[PDB]
Automatic annotation (TrEMBL), chains A, B:
Subcellular localization(s) per the UniProt record: Cytoplasm; Nucleus, Nucleoplasm; Nucleus, Nucleolus
Record protein name field: E3 ubiquitin-protein ligase Mdm2
Family affiliation: Belongs to the MDM2/MDM4 family.
Binding locations of Zn(2+) 1: C3, C6, C26, C29
Domain RING-type: 3-44
Binding site for Zn(2+) 2: H17, H22, C40, C43
Source organism (scientific name): Xenopus tropicalis (Western clawed frog)
Lineage: Eukaryota, Metazoa, Chordata, Craniata, Vertebrata
Top-rank lineage group of the source organism: Eukaryota
Length: 56, 56
């Protein structure tokens, strides 16, 4: 299923905080949250980085 | 599908290199690769870090 935010792009934007990540959003939408200094939408941890994730 | 290495755990071990990640192994198997100084199994980039990834 697509990014829960835009419903258009795949869930390829891994929201990384320490050793864990929440993957529920696209890279574009996750980056927007990081750039706006917003926390992770599912766990409220501050975002360290967005990783463009490929499901090999 | 499960981790392509152990066939037991989920694909929750994101192999991070720069801004991208390859997600095909579990955290346990991916950590073994990083600890043994192995590159990413699909792209041969050095592994910067393993992120335990939850698919939401
Ligand atoms: Zn999106
Ligand atoms: Zn989170
Ligand atoms: Zn495994
Ligand atoms: Zn790779």
């Amino acid at each position: 299923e697509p990014c829960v935010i835009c419903q258009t792009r795949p869930k390829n934007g891994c929201i990384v905080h320490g050793r864990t990540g929440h993957l529920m959003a696209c890279y574009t939408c996750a980056k927007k949250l990081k750039k706006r200094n917003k926390p992770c939408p599912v766990c409220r941890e501050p975002i360290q980085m967005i990783v463009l994730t490929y499901f090999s």
